[PDB]
Design a protein around this ligand. Structure first.
Ligand SMILES: Nc1ncnc2c1ncn2[C@@H]1O[C@H](COP(=O)(O)OP(=O)(O)OP(=O)(O)O)[C@@H](O)[C@H]1O
Ligand SMILES: Nc1ncnc2c1ncn2[C@@H]1O[C@H](COP(=O)(O)OP(=O)(O)OP(=O)(O)O)[C@@H](O)[C@H]1O
Ligand SMILES: [Mg+2]
Ligand SMILES: [Mg+2]
Lengths: 638, 259, 209, 630
C-alpha cells in the first residue's frame, strides 16, 4: 500500500543512561576522555594560530591543568584550548554522537598535521560515571563566556558569563559522587593519568596540597605541588630515527620501564603502509626474574593510538618467545570500538605482529655483528631463542642462525653453527653433537671419543631446551645434525678399519650373544661399536624414542604421567668396545666357560655402569651399590 | 540503565589487587580476617544501639504510664511536670538511639558486597554416578539391532573415518565421532574394502583397510586392557605416534592378525 | 607432547639471608634496595590498611633475586600450626616502643620494627637487646636518646618518667656502613615518639634509596 | 534570563553509524540478537495466551524458522511472535534505545513466570553489521500486515504488505552484504547457533536446500534443553548423564554431578560435573579454559574459566545460568568482574563438598583421585586458603599399606603414642624408596612412612608442613629422629668416639666432597649413606629441578643443600676402615676405598654423580684387577 516514510528516532532518556551505564566498565577512562578533549581543543588552537598567530592574542600557553577540590568533592579541569561558543555548547557538547572534531577533520585540509584524538561525540558523557554533575565554562574567541550545566538528567542548560575569567578554552567542573572520593587522592590521580595521558603533546600539571612541614617558621615547606612531571616522557618514535641518538633514546628506555641502565638492543620500526604506525623495540641487558612466569599478564609491547595508551595485548602484538622485548607501538589509523578499550578487527594486529617480528629478527641479525654484546644478548635470552626455534617453525630460517654453542674444537669459546659448518671437514657431512647434563659430562663421554679421533667437531649441548631444539632442528646449512648418543653413528672412516671391525664382530660374536642372554630384558641389542675408545661398552639410545637426557627431562618436568609415551620412548642398546682389555678378557672367559656365573655377573656390573656412564638411571641403584659393597668386602677379606 | 548496585563488591581473595613486595598467600587471609572483624564490630554496634533504644523506649513507656497516674493523682501533677521532662529526655534518648540505628542503616547501605551479602545457598544437590548396577547385555542381541541401524545411521561417518590417513585427523575425527569406536564400525570398513575391491577402487580399499586396522587396533588392546574402546582409543594413537619403528611394525603384524 | 609449567616457592627467609650474609658492614647499596623493596611493600600495605605490628625479621622473605616479600600480617592470621612459646617474651628488639608500650599498630610502629632490622642487616646482628619491655626500651634509648615524661604518648603501660634521660649515639657510627642519610632515616624510624618518625612513603622516596 | 534550558539532543545520523560500526565488534551475533528477540515475542504470546487462549487462534505454535536464500544472498528469519502494529514498527522498531520488551515486562509486573531480555533497545540494528538492508514484515493480532523497509540510512518506510499472509509475528529479511555470504553456510549458521542459542527455550529450525534440493527442516538445530532450570530433585541420573554427555560430547557419562543455585543480589542456577577420566590435553598451556560456561537467562555470554574457577579445578564441566548480571552494551562482556570472583568462591565451596562426598564413596573416589590427584596436589601448591580441605583428600601408599592408598589422617590414626611426626620418603618410584636405607631403621623402630613417588610431591610436601597437629619429616634429611633408648644412646656416643678419628680421616679424604662425616643409627644394611641438610633441595628435588628447561641455574646458590656422609658403625667394612685408620691413616688403598664408598653411597642415595665416566673407570680398574688384566 501507500509507502509511509519515517525518520529513525531515538529515546535519548534511555540512550543517555546507556551511554553512561553500559558503554564503559573501567571508570579510569573518566580522566582519559576529559584530558583527550582538552588536548583536542589545544590542537584546534595550534592550527588556528599556525595559520593565524593573532589567534593567540587572548593566550599563547597551551596546556592541561587538573585541580582537585576535596573540600567540595569536586575536580577542576583546566582546558587552555580553543574552547566552545554558546552554539557549540548547545550543538556539539549538548548533542549525543556530535563532535566538532569532525568539523576540523573536514575544515583542516591545510591542517593535515593536525590529528584530533577520537571522534564519536559521546565520550563527554562518560564524565558522569563518577561525577554527579558537570559544568563546562567556556569562551571561544568567537563568543563570550558561558557556563554549560547538566547532571545528565535528560536536559542541560547554558548560562551567561559569571565573571570568572575564562578567556580561552574551558573550565570543567566535575562534581564527584559520594563514593568516588578516591579520585581526589594524589596517588589515584597519578595512577590513572600515567596509564592514559602518558604521551599527551601538551603538558599536564596537577595542583595538589603539598605535603609540608607545619607552617611554624621553626620550619615551613611549600604549600602546593605543581605536577608537570606527568608528561616528562615524550614521544620518540615520532621523530626521525636518523636524528634520534642514545643520549635521549636510552633515557626513553629507562623511562619506558623502571630500569636504571641503558638498554641492550633496540630497533625503530617505521610503517608507512595501510597500517601506518611506528614502533620502538627494546631489549633489556638482563632477563627479568619473572621471564618465564607465564601466570602473569604480558605488558612489554604496548599499543597506543594517536599517542594514547589503548591496549597492551602482547599475546597478539608479539609471539611468546619474544616476550622480553619492550616497546611502544603507535598508530593513528586503528578502528577502535565505541569504548576505545578494544581494537576491532584483530586481523590488523596479526599483520602488525608479523611485521614487528620481521624487525625483531633484523635486530637480532644486527646484533650478531656485535659479537661482544651479542654474546651478552644471547646469554640473556638464549632460552627465548631456543623456544622460538622450538615453536616458530616459520622463522627458524633466521632464529637457527642466531644459535651459538661450545664445541670440541671451539672449547670455551662459544661459536656459531654457521662457523661450525664453514669449518667442517670434507668428509664431515653432518653436524656432530651431544646433549647431556653438563659440559664436562659430554666432553668426557665415551660417545665423543672416536668422534674426536676421526677429527670431528662435537657441539656440546646441556640445556633441556637444547634437547627440545634438536627435536625440531634437523638440518642446518644443508647438513643434518647427528647425535653421537644414538645408535648408528656413521663416522667417516677407513673401509679397511670397518673390515677390522667386522672381523672383531666375528671375534666377539659369541660374546655379544652371551651378553645379550645375560642382559635379557635389560638391553634390546648387544653389539659392537668403534665410537668407544677407553670404555669396554656403552648403553646407547636408539634411533627412536627418548634419549637418556630426554627421558630425564620429560619424566621429571612433565606434569602429565604419560606412561604410554614413556613406554614407547624407553629404547636403548649396548655397544661393545672389542679393543678394550676387559672385553677381550670377557671373550676369553666366555670361551673358557659361557656358563661361568661370575663372568655373567661381571657383564651385568658392566651393563649397570654402562647405563650410569650413558646417563641411564638404574632400576635399583641400591643393589648396584650392594654389589659394590660385596666386592669391597671381598677386597677387604670380610 | 543502572548497574550501580554492583559497584561496591569486596573480594578478599582478589588476585588482581596484589603487589610485588607482598606475599598474597597470607594477605588474602588477612583480608578475610579484617572483613570478618569489621562485620563483628558492626553487628555488636547495631545490637547495642538497638538495646539502648529499647531500654529508653521501655523507660519512657513506663514513665508515660506513670504520667497518666501522676495526672490522676490528687496533686501529683507537680511530679507529673517533673516526670514529663524526664520522659521527654528518655524519648530524646530513645530517639537518638534510633537516629544512631538510622545511621547503621546508612552503613548497611554503604556496605560492600560479598559472598555473605550478595547471595545465599538457594539450592544444593550432589550426586555421585555410582552404578548403573553390575549387569551385562548380550552384545549379539545388541548388534542385531545396532549393527543394522547404527552402521547405516553413521555410514557416512564410518566412511569418513575410512577416508582418513593422517594420524592426527583420525584421532581428532574419532574424538568428534567417538561413538564410531566399535566393532560395528570396523566390520563395515572390512565389508567396504570388499566392495571397493569389486568396484576396482583398490587405492581407496587400501586406505580403508589401513583405517580398518586402526579401529581393529583400538579394539585389540581395548579387549586386552579389559576396557571400553571408546575410553582408550586415544592411547592407540599415543602408542602409534610414539612407538619405535621396529616395534610398530611388529604391532602392525599382530594387528593385521587381530583384524 | 603438550607444554605446561610449574614453579617453586621461595623459602629464603630474611633470617636465612642474614645467616648467609657477611660480617658487619653489609653492602649498603644492597640494603638500600632491600629497604626500598620493603618500604614499597609497606606503602601498599598501608594503602590496604594492613595491620601487622607483630611483623618480625622472620616474616620477611628475601628472594634469590633480592626481592623483599612480606607475609604474616599479625597474630590474627599467623601461627595456625606449631609456633613459639615465647613469641613475645623473646627479646623484642624488633618491636616498636608502641608495642613495648602496649598501644597499637601504625606506620611508625612497622617502620620502627624494620628500622632495627635494617640495622641488623648492616651488622648481621640485632640492633638492640633487652629483657622486659622497659629494659628493651632501656637499650633502644641508648641509641635514639631519652626524655622524661614529656615526650611519651598517651597509650603507655610502662612507667614513663622512670626512664632516666640520656643522649643519642650517632646511628651513622653505631651501625656499620650506615651512610648518614640512612642514619637519619633510621634514627627517624627508631625515634621513640611515633609521630616524630618517618612514613614508609617518605623514607621510600628519600634520595638515600 | 541568565540561563537557558535545553533538552539533550542526539545526532541519529552519526549515532546510527556508531551503532552499526563501533557498538559491536563481532558481527555473527546478529543471529543471537534477532533470535533473542524472537524468543521474547514467543514468551509474549505465551503470557498473553495464559490470560486469553484465543490469542493462539492465529497459530498455536511457538518457534523460530531460519531460511537462508543464496539465490538472493539473503536470510529469511521467521519469528512466530505476536507481531508489531504499524505504531510499534514506527515507535519501537524504528527507534534507538527503545523496546516494547520493557513495556511488556511492565505488564508482567502483575505476576508472571515470564523471562525476557532486551533492556537496551538497540539489538535490532546489529542486523546491519552483516546485512546491507533489512526488511521486517509483520502482522500483529490487533493490526494489519505491514512491510517495514530500511537500510539504516536515517529513515525507514512502512507499507501494508501484500501476497503471503502472516498469521502472527514477524519476518526479517536480511539483505546480506556481498562479502557476508559466509552466513549462508550451514556450518557457519550452526556455529553461531551452538555459540549463543544452544539453550533457547523455543524450537529453532534451520532450513537447508537438501534432498530434490528442498528446504529441509532441521528441527534438532537447538534440541538441547536446560537442566539446571528444572527441579534437581525431579531430575534423574540418566537425565544428568545425558546432559553431561551432551554438554561435553563425551560418550561416557559423568562421575558426579551437583546442582548449585544462589539467591539474592547474585542469583543463578548451575550444574557442576566431575568427569570419570582426565583429558589428554588437561595440562596444555594454550588450552582454552571453557569447561564451565556462563549464561544469562540461558543466553551464552562467556566461558572464561580462567577467572570463574581455580586452575587446579580446571577439569570440572558445567553450566552457570545467572538471572541478572551487569552486562555491557555489548552483552559479550560483563561489567564488574568481581562478581565472577564471588561466583568462583561459591563454586569452589561446592566443589570441595562434592569431593568430600565423593571421598565417602571410596571406590569412585579412588577412581577420581587416580585421575585428578595431580590437580588436588596442584591445589595444595597453589591455593593457600583451601589447602587444609584439599589435604583431607590426599592419599598415599604407606609402609603398612599394600598398593592401597591411605589418607594422611589414616596415617595419623596409626601413629605411635610417642610419635610426633609423619615419616615419609620421596622418590621416583615406590620400589626405589621401599629399598632405601633411610626407611630401614624406621621399619626396625616400628614406624610407617609415606611413600611419595611423583615429582610434584616435592611441591606438595613443601606445603604439607603439619597435618592434624602432626609434623612431617623426611627420612632422607639430616636430623631424622627415631626412638632413642638411653642405653643405646650411650653406646652410640661410645661408637662416635670409636669411629671419631675414622670420620675425621674420611673427611680429610673427601674434604670437598662431603660437608660432614658422621655415624648414624638411621642406617641398617648399608655401611654409609648421603643425607640432605634441612636447608635446600633434596636429592629428589634437586634432580627434578635440574630437569626444568626454563629454570634459572643461578638460584641454586640458595638451594644447594649440604651433603653429609652417614656411617653405619655396625658394618665390617666400617669397622675394617677404623682398624685400617689405626694401622695407617695414610694408606692410599684405604683412602681410595673411602672415595669409592662415598661415590657409591652418593649415587645410590639418589644424588648426582659428578663424573660417571671416572666412577666407572675406577670400577673398570677394579675389574681389571679381578681379571688380572693389569
Ligand atoms: N574540554 C573541551 N574543550 C572543547 N570542546 C570540548 C571539550 N570537551 C568536549 N568538547 C566537545 O565535544 C566534542 C567531541 O567530544 P567527545 O569526546 O564527546 O567526542 P570525541 O572526543 O570527538 O570522541 P569521543 O566521543 O570518543 O571522546 C568536541 O568536538 C567538542 O565540541
Ligand atoms: N519477533 C518479534 N515479534 C514482535 N516484535 C519484535 C520481534 N522482534 C523484535 N521486535 C520488536 O523490536 C523492537 C526493537 O527492540 P530490540 O530487540 O532492538 O531491542 P532489544 O533487542 O529488545 O534490546 P537489546 O538491544 O537489549 O536486545 C522491540 O520493541 C520489539 O517489540
Ligand atoms: Mg573527547
Ligand atoms: Mg530484542
Amino acid at each position: 500500500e501507500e509507502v509511509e516514510t519515517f525518520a529513525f528516532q531515538a529515546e535519548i532518556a534511555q540512550l543517555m543512561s546507556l551511554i553512561i551505564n553500559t558503554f564503559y566498565s573501567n571508570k579510569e577512562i573518566f580522566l582519559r576522555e576529559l584530558i583527550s578533549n582538552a588536548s583536542d581543543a589545544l590542537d584546534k588552537i595550534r592550527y588556528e594560530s599556525l595559520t593565524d598567530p593573532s589567534k593567540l592574542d587572548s593566550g599563547k600557553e597551551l596546556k592541561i591543568d587538573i585541580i582537585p577540590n576535596p573540600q567540595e568533592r569536586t575536580l577542576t579541569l583546566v582546558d587552555t584550548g580553543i574552547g566552545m561558543t554558546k552554539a557549540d555548547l548547545i550543538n556539539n557538547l549538548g548533542t549525543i554522537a556530535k563532535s566538532g572534531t569532525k568539523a576540523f577533520m573536514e575544515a583542516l585540509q591545510a591542517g593535515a598535521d593536525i590529528s584530533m584524538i577520537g571522534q564519536f561525540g559521546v565520550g563527554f558523557y562518560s564524565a558522569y560515571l563518577v561525577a554527579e554533575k558537570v559544568v563546562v565554562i567556556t569562551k571561544h574567541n568567537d563568543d563570550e563566556q558561558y557556563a554549560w550545566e547538566s547532571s545528565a538528567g535528560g536536559s542541560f542548560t547554558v548560562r551567561a558569563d559569571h565573571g570568572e575569567p575564562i578567556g580561552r578554552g574551558t573550565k570543567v567542573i566535575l562534581h564527584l559522587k559520594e563514593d568516588q572520593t578516591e579520585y581526589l587522592e594524589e596517588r589515584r590521580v597519578k595512577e590513572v593519568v600515567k596509564k592514559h595521558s602518558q604521551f599527551i603533546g601538551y603538558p599536564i600539571t596537577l595542583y595538589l596540597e603539598k605535603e609540608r612541614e607545619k607552617e611554624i617558621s621553626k620550619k615551613i615547606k611549600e604549600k602546593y605541588i605543581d605536577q608537570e612531571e606527568l608528561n616528562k616522557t615524550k614521544p620518540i618514535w615520532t621523530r626521525n630515527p636518523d636524528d634520534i641518538t642514545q643520549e635521549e633514546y636510552g633515557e626513553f628506555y629507562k623511562s619506558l620501564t623502571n630500569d636504571w641502565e641503558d638498554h641492550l638492543a633496540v630497533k625503530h620500526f617505521s610503517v608507512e603502509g595501510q597500517l601506518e604506525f611506528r614502533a620502538l623495540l627494546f631489549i633489556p641487558r638482563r632477563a627479568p626474574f619473572d621471564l618465564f612466569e607465564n601466570k602473569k599478564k604480558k605488558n612489554n609491547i604496548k599499543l597506543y593510538v594517536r599517542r594514547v595508551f589503548i591496549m597492551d595485548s602482547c599475546d597478539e602484538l608479539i609471539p611468546e618467545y619474544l616476550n622480553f622485548i619492550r616497546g611502544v607501538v603507535d598508530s593513528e589509523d586503528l578502528p577502535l570500538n565505541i569504548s576505545r578499550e578494544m581494537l576491532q578487527q584483530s586481523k590488523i594486529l596479526k599483520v602488525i605482529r608479523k611485521n614487528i617480528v620481521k624487525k625483531c629478527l633484523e635486530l637480532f641479525s644486527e646484533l650478531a655483528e656485535d659479537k661482544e654484546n651479542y654474546k651478552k644478548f644471547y646469554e640473556a635470552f638464549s632460552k627465548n631463542l631456543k623456544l622460538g626455534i622450538h615453536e616458530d617453525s616459520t622463522n627458524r630460517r633466521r632464529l637457527s642462525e642466531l644459535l651459538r654453542y661450545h664445541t670440541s674444537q671451539s672449547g670455551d669459546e662459544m661459536t656459531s653453527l654457521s662457523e661450525y659448518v664453514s669449518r667442517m671437514k670434507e668428509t664431515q657431512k653432518s653436524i656432530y653433537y651431544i646433549t647431556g647434563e653438563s659440559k664436562e659430562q659430554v666432553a668426557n663421554s665415551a660417545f665423543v671419543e672416536r668422534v674426536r679421533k676421526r677429527g670431528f667437531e662435537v657441539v656440546y649441548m646441556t640445556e633441556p631446551i637444547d634437547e627440545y631444539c634438536v627435536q625440531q632442528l634437523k638440518e642446518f646449512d644443508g647438513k643434518s645434525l647427528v647425535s653421537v648418543t644414538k645408535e648408528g653413528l656413521e663416522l667417516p672412516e677407513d673401509e679397511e678399519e670397518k673390515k677390522k671391525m667386522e672381523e672383531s664382530k666375528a671375534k666377539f660374536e659369541n660374546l655379544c650373544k652371551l651378553m645379550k642372554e645375560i642382559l635379557d630384558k635389560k638391553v634390546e641389542k648387544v653389539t659392537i661399536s668403534n665410537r668407544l675408545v677407553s670404555s669396554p661398552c656403552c648403553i646407547v639410545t636408539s634411533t627412536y624414542g627418548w634419549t637418556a637426557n630426554m627421558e630425564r627431562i620429560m619424566k621429571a618436568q612433565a606434569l602429565r604421567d604419560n606412561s604410554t609415551m614413556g613406554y614407547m620412548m624407553a629404547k636403548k642398546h649396548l655397544e661393545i668396545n672389542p679393543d678394550h682389555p676387559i672385553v677381550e678378557t670377557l671373550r676369553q672367559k666366555a670361551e673358557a666357560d659361557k656358563n661361568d656365573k661370575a663372568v655373567k655377573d661381571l657383564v651385568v656390573l658392566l651393563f649397570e655402569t654402562a647405563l650410569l656412564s650413558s646417563g641411564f638411571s638404574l632400576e635399583d641403584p641400591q643393589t648396584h651399590s650392594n654389589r659394590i659393597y660385596r666386592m669391597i668386602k671381598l677386597g677387604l677379606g670380610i | 540503565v543502572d548497574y550501580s548496585v554492583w559497584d561496591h563488591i569486596e573480594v578478599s581473595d582478589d588476585e588482581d589487587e596484589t603487589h610485588p613486595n607482598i606475599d598474597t598467600a597470607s594477605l588474602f587471609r588477612w583480608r578475610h580476617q579484617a572483613r570478618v572483624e569489621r562485620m563483628e564490630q558492626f553487628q555488636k554496634e547495631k545490637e547495642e544501639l538497638d538495646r539502648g533504644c529499647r531500654e529508653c523506649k521501655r523507660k519512657v513507656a513506663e514513665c508515660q504510664r506513670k504520667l497518666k497516674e501522676l495526672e490522676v493523682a490528687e496533686g501529683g501533677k507537680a511530679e507529673l511536670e517533673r516526670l514529663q521532662a524526664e520522659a521527654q529526655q528518655l524519648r530524646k534518648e530513645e530517639r537518638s538511639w534510633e537516629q544512631k540505628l538510622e545511621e547503621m542503616r546508612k552503613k548497611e547501605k554503604s556496605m560492600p558486597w560479598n559472598v555473605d551479602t550478595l547471595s545465599k545457598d538457594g539450592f544444593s544437590k550432589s550426586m555421585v554416578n555410582t552404578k548403573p548396577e553390575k549387569t551385562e547385555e548380550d552384545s549379539e542381541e545388541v548388534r542385531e539391532q545396532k549393527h543394522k541401524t547404527f552402521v547405516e545411521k553413521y555410514e557416512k561417518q564410518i566412511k569418513h573415518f575410512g577416508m582418513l590417513r593422517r594420524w592426527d585427523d583420525s584421532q581428532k575425527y574419532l574424538s568428534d565421532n567417538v561413538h564410531l569406536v566399535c566393532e560395528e564400525t570396523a566390520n563395515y570398513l572390512v565389508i567396504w574394502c570388499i566392495d571397493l575391491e569389486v568396484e576396482e577402487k583398490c587405492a581407496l580399499m587400501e586406505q580403508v583397510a589401513h583405517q580398518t586396522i586402526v579401529m581393529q587396533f583400538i579394539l585389540e588392546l581395548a579387549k586386552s586392557l579389559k576396557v571400553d574402546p571408546r575410553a582408550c582409543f586415544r592411547q592407540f594413537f599415543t602408542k602409534i605416534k610414539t612407538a619405535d619403528r621396529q616395534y610398530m611394525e611388529g604391532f602392525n603384524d599382530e594387528l593385521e592378525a587381530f583384524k | 607432547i603438550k607444554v605446561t609449567l610449574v614453579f617453586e616457592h621461595v623459602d629464603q627467609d630474611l633470617r636465612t639471608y642474614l645467616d648467609k650474609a657477611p660480617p658487619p658492614g653489609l653492602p649498603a647499596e644492597t640494603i638500600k634496595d632491600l629497604m626500598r623493596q620493603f618500604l614499597r611493600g609497606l606503602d601498599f600495605l598501608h594503602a590496604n590498611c594492613i595491620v601487622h605490628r607483630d611483623l618480625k625479621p622472620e616474616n620477611i622473605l628475601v628472594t634469590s633475586g633480592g626481592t623483599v616479600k612480606l607475609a604474616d600480617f599479625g597474630l590474627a592470621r599467623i601461627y595456625s600450626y606449631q609456633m613459639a612459646l615465647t613469641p613475645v617474651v623473646v627479646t623484642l628488639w624488633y618491636r616498636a616502643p608502641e608495642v613495648l608500650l602496649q598501644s597499637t599498630y601504625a606506620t611508625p610502629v612497622d617502620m620502627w620494627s624494620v628500622g632495627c632490622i635494617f640495622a641488623e642487616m648492616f651488622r648481621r646482628k640485632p640492633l638492640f637487646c633487652g629483657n622486659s619491655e622497659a629494659d628493651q626500651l632501656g637499650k633502644i634509648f641508648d641509641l635514639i636518646g631519652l626524655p622524661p615524661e614529656d615526650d611519651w604518648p598517651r597509650d603507655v603501660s610502662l612507667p614513663r618518667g622512670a626512664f632516666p634521660p640520656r643522649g643519642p649515639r650517632p646511628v651513622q657510627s653505631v651501625v656499620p656502613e650506615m651512610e648518614e642519610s640512612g642514619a637519619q632515616l633510621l634514627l627517624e624510624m627508631l625515634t621513640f615518639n611515633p609521630h616524630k618518625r618517618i612514613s614508609a612513603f617518605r623514607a621510600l622516596q628519600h634520595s638515600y634509596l
